[PDB]
């Protein structure tokens, strides 16, 4: 600590190294994460005091400094001053990516490895925000450079994978947009299963979830009896099955020619 200070005031980031005029030391900048086979490293044998200047864009929470006096077998000192910096975490997520290995296998790629939670999201064709499916699903822990195995029965262009850390949204990868896209006008049905042969059918509408059959003037409530039939007839696509829940994607193209009388 008394040898390192940080100044983010010179519109850039400065590492003020407060050592004596005569001090000889090894300096190494690193990203505190397993990187693999031999990669070129950031290293400098110096004669301090020095000011190492970095760009606000280089900041990541695992960006650490290693110092050691230039003496044989000298011990190395490690400091991580960006662990809780707001800008670092900001840049970290800009550089993070979620990928598909298999439908039931996802992988997170990030420079640093922070605790994160992931869950499936449902995007409506009308531009309106992507509503996550918690419940009946849950935010499950997603670890950087480790496989996330979700029991997704089928991919859907309307499904996006959401990533949160520090209970804030950071990633929204619509994994089936190029492969199965664009967005289908399918109603999502959420049957919440429970005790005493319980199953409550609900329809994820832009204006929240509506239980079926309903007396509303809302598209899915009006078509309630028809959607309940599509499902029972097996015309609806099962996206997720569980002991206490099921997700269903019901296409609405069959109702595209239905018109109301004029009043």
């Amino acid at each position, epitope marked *: 600590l008394p040898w390192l200070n940080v100044s983010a005031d010179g519109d850039n980031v400065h590492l003020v190294l407060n050592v004596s005029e005569e001090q000889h030391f090894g300096l190494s900048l690193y990203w505190n994460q397993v990187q693999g086979p031999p990669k070129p490293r950031w290293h400098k044998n110096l004669t301090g005091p020095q000011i190492i200047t970095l760009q606000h864009t280089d900041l990541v929470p695992c960006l650490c400094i290693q110092v050691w006096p230039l003496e044989p077998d000298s011990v190395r000192t490690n400091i991580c001053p960006f662990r809780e910096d707001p800008r670092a975490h900001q840049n970290l997520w800009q550089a993070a990516r979620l990928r598909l290995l298999t439908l039931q296998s996802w992988l997170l790629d990030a420079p640093c490895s922070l605790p994160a939670e992931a869950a499936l999201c449902w995007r409506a064709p009308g531009g309106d925000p992507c509503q996550p499916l918690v419940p009946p699903l849950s935010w499950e822990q997603v670890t950087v450079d480790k496989v996330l195995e979700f029991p997704l029965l089928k991919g859907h262009p309307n499904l996006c994978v959401q990533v949160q850390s520090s209970e804030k949204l950071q990633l929204q990868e619509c994994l089936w947009a190029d492969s199965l896209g664009p967005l289908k006008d399918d109603v999502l049905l959420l049957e919440t299963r429970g005790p005493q042969d319980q199953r409550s059918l609900c329809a994820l509408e832009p204006s929240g979830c509506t239980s079926l*059959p309903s*007396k*509303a*003037s809302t598209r899915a*409530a*009006r*078509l*309630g*009896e*028809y959607l309940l039939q599509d499902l029972q007839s097996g015309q609806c696509l099962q996206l997720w099955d569980d002991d206490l829940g099921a997700l269903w994607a019901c296409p609405m193209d069959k109702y595209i*020619h*239905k*018109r*109301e*009388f*004029r*009043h």
Partner: antibody
Amino acid sequence: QVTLKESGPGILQPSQTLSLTCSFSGFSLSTSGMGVSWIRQPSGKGLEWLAHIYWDNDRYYNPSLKSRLTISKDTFSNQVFLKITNVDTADTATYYCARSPMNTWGDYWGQGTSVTVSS
Amino acid sequence: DVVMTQTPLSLPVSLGDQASISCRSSQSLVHSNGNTYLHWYLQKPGQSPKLLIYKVSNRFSGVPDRFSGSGSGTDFTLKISRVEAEDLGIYFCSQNTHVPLTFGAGTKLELKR
């Protein structure tokens, strides 16, 4: 009182064109909101709506019969018409016209005209 | 098409009795404008249908207080309080929320003996 009277040939052969006329009194198709619908009823069966026309000439048809129906009107003569092309036995019915303004669809019906389609 | 399921199809009653007729639609009759275009008609032999109730519960001009309509969404009921001989005939429900406009099969209100 509102009165409507349907007219047309009593018997036609299959493939012929049925031309129906609804002559009315007690209302005008120049009146904003006013409309007239055509409905049919095969003997001892349920009613089947055919077509509707509003005062502004907006027209609606039964989608299953759409290509065979044409509804039209003559406001000056107080008449509404229905043309049904390529008739067949299923077109055998009593045909009704009914005053159908925007708030009260089919609020006054004519006494109907019987049509038999047979070879 | 919106199917109008009318029950019972035959309704034997005694004069002075109350009669109840049910109409269930295959989908909600609530229009985008918020109204429910469900009507009840009576048809007598050799005669044309006469409008009794419009928009679920509104009695048409000249219709007696003994006729009342109720219900919402997909479930509707016509109640006739003190059945008279002039009430005997076929009652039908109709909807005009959706194109095509559709009707129930009819309930024949008949006399018991």
